[PDB]
From a paper:
The [name]-[name] domain is contrived based on the high structural similarity of AvrPib with two MAX effectors, AVR-Pia and AVR1-CO39, recognized by cognate [name]-HMA, the binding interface between AVR1-CO39 and [name]-HMA, and the distinct surface charge of AvrPib and RAG5-HMA. V1027 of [name] could form the hydrophobic interaction with V27 of AvrPib, while it could affect the interaction with Y40 of AVR1-CO39. Since there is a positively charged patch on the surface of AvrPib, the C-terminal K-rich region of the HMA domain would have blocked the interaction between [name]-HMA and AvrPib. To circumvent the issue, we generated the [name]-HMAK/E variant (K to E mutations including K at the 1,071, 1,073, 1,080, 1,081, 1,085, and 1,086 sites). However, no interaction was detected between [name]-HMAK/E and AvrPib. Finally, we contrived another RGA variant, [name]-HMAS1027V, G1009D, K/E (henceforth [name]-[name]), by combining all the above mutations, which were confirmed to resemble the native [name]-HMA structure. Again, we performed a Y2H assay, which showed that [name]-[name] could interact with AvrPib but not with AVR-Pia, implying that the mutations in [name]-[name], which do not affect the conformation of the domain, acquire the binding affinity to the originally unrecognized MAX effector AvrPib. The data obtained from the MST assays also confirmed the interaction between [name]-[name] and AvrPib, which displayed a dissociation constant (Kd) of 148 μM, compared to 31 μM for the [name]-HMA/AVR-Pia interaction.
Interestingly, [name] and Pik1 encode [name] immune receptors with a HMA domain, which acts as an ID directly binding corresponding MAX Avr effectors and mediates their helper [name] receptor–triggered immunity.
Residue numbers in the entry:
A (entry chain J), B (entry chain A), C (entry chain G), D (entry chain M), E (entry chain K), F (entry chain D), ...: 997 to 1069
The structure:
């Protein structure tokens, strides 16, 4: 199990649901949550997640997406 | 902000992803989580979520779902 | 069976007993307890107990009651 | 706080509810519970309860009452 | 110097606040307090109050209302 | 003779057993099987099977179930 | 997995259902079937089946049971 | 004399002849018959018949034998 | 179904059992019996029995067999 | 569940009551009955009855008894 | 000969044998039986039985007992 | 809904009136009626009657009383 | 001279005669009598009576018998 933290631009709600649903759609993901002072940290925890192709999908479908953390549990 | 626990028929991983992404796509949802020894408990946390509509939508796309818990956070 | 948590403003023993005896008179109720570091959580467990009706009746008789949780056991 | 168990004649639901509401009505009571295999064991937990007047109050309003356990926790 | 007690149908805190504010709006009332074991009684004190208009407005805007007492102080 | 396929939330082996035995205990049933990649398809073959009754029994003593197919052999 | 064939005295539908439900109730069983020109051979397939325990259960509740074959698949 | 009934699985007639000829081979036996709507009841009457020994003989050579009755005539 | 009576020379235990086990051995027989004042009458009832064949093989294995009665029941 | 018929010396009705109450007091016994033209046949039906211990007990308190029949139901 | 049906609280085996041995001990009783879906119908058949003193004795030592039927044969 | 017939010793009209009045007083009695060739039977009809206390009362206050019939309508 | 009393299971007149004639057939016996409220006591009085042999004779040809008394006259 891995923990991924992505800084994403998600000003409103329809866009924060957009990022959340896209990360949730990756097989193996068992936790998705938005955290941080500025509602800017998408954290994805699961198994068999490729952090690279996940952040690529975020950038293609949302906006800027920087990968801040990839850690084991 | 309320927390909702739904028992959902999601026996594999493409089906867990589809329930996670469905819950995630609801505006105001902040946390979607897979839990339970049998991995059939969808935990959903967020603002102004309608648990009845949520469970009906899970029922539509996953075929079988049952509300277990609604809690004010 | 079902577990229901109501937050009730019951600062002294008489208001505590009023809320607890009231919930205990509801047919189908097999557990009542006051919990929480603030001693403000009324826990009611039983069969066929309607959450809305119980809060309504806490509001009619004692006042200062808020539904916190409803959970299948 | 202490724990008290009284075997009470409680055949139906009007009878459980008045036994339970009676115990819940005494000051200091934290927990009231209907236990046992035949639903005759009224568990009462709380502070400063005199088991003697409580069973006396139960005999006086719910028929035969049998003090079976009092113990500190 | 007249004191008025009205039994009102107000079985929740929202309802109790509404009946109290309406009572305090009528000409001549100095003080509105709520009383009664189940918080179903307004006490209204003042000079030059018409209790007929007071109770009739509570009936129109807040449901059922019964004038229990009109007495000097 | 008739074949029926029911999707059933039977995530573990104990609940698969109870779905199997429920179907098996219907008089006339010649075949009960757990099929499907996700081991969630109960197939029943026999004489005088009532599909609606059987799903209802499955719901009642198994939780969630959905009729997928009724076929005459 | 393992296939088991047991000869069982089950001359009517109620005793066919009895033996069939009995085998179905064994954890790990995914196939139960009545075969044979004489309708007296029940086929049990699944995982972790203890043949002695199964046949002894059939005999203890149906009177007559005789293990014919144990076959790996 | 003594009458013994054994339930025997004898679906065809080589198995019926085999059980019935073997019970007849027992010295002391002056009646054997196959009775029952299921034709599964081997009845044997005679003098000095040991029921335990006869059923053991049936189990050794035929299999699928169960003692149903022993009565003095 | 048909009834046959044969006078057989069967003086001792072994000879009765041999006679009766051979009649019991014929397919279709469902009762065999030794009646008669002096032990000598072998009663055989069943379906599709040929009396001449039966007596023939009795004479071959027990010496002297006389056919006394053939009757439909 | 077995049925047991015992011949018991119970010539009057104080002694029939003695035998019937002793059979009745055996755990698992659900039918006791006086039968026979001479009213000396005690019929006992139930679960886990030991016929020999039962006859021995009848013999101890009624003086004479003899086992006549043991039958599976 | 009269038939008597008493509803008796006899949840375990020791308790059903206590009631039965008490009814069997009544002179003139020739049948005692437990029936009903819930095994709570004590059936007593015999001669010169007073149902009143019988149900009184039942209540005196086996909880409560309700006389459901007195009828002739 | 039950009908009770009591043979009562009441050999004159004063006695007949007394026993009927007594029967009409006990709980659950709706109708009392005198019958029999010699006007010696009570017919008592009602719901929730204890026949034991009824016949015991007649025994205590009006002499001999035999419960001939307890039966539903 | 000696007197012997035997309890015999002789529930009809046919078997009382068999017991009587048996005791009478013993050389040296000059009194045989059926005594007792329940007519089950055989009294034998005479010379050279073997009590054990007589009871053995009674059992062998009368069924059940129990020696009650042996007295020298």
């Amino acid at each position: 199990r891995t923990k991924i933290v992505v800084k994403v631009h998600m000003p409103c709600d329809k866009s924060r649901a957009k990022a959340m649903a896209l990360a949730a759609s990756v097989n193996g993901v068992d936790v998705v949550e938005i955290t941080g002072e500025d509602k800017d940290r998408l954290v994805v925890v699961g198994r068999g997640i490729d952090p690279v192709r996940l952040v690529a999908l975020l950038r293609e479908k949302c906006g800027l997406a920087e990968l801040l953390m990839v850690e084991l549990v």
